[PDB]
């Protein structure tokens, strides 16, 4: 016969790139947008803005 050597994703290396988190009710709440902005830095230039 032959076995099926399973592989875990968290035990891989690629997992560093993404943060995985389970969201149970998403498919229900996915009917609308979530729409969060993030940031943008800005220097303090001289002269009045």
């Amino acid at each position: 016969c032959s076995t099926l050597s399973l592989v875990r994703f968290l035990e891989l290396g690629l997992s560093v790139a993404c943060v995985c988190t389970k969201f149970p009710e998403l498919s229900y709440v996915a009917e609308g947008t979530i729409q969060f902005e993030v940031q943008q830095p800005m220097i303090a230039r001289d002269g009045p803005h």
Binding site: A44, R45, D46, G47, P48, H49
Partner: protein, 46 residues
């Protein structure tokens, strides 16, 4: 006889400069935080 150890008195000046920044909010926006309230139908907007 002309060596006569020398002396000097140099002077400098300051230089003015400014460093500004910008910031803005809306008027009614700021009003919502003043009122202390424990709902009152305004949490999300608050």
């Amino acid at each position: 006889p002309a060596d006569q150890p020398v002396h000097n008195y140099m002077i400098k000046r300051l230089d003015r400069r400014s460093l500004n920044a910008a910031f803005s909010i809306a008027v009614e926006a700021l009003g919502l935080i003043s009122g202390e309230n424990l709902h009152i139908s305004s949490a999300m907007r608050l």
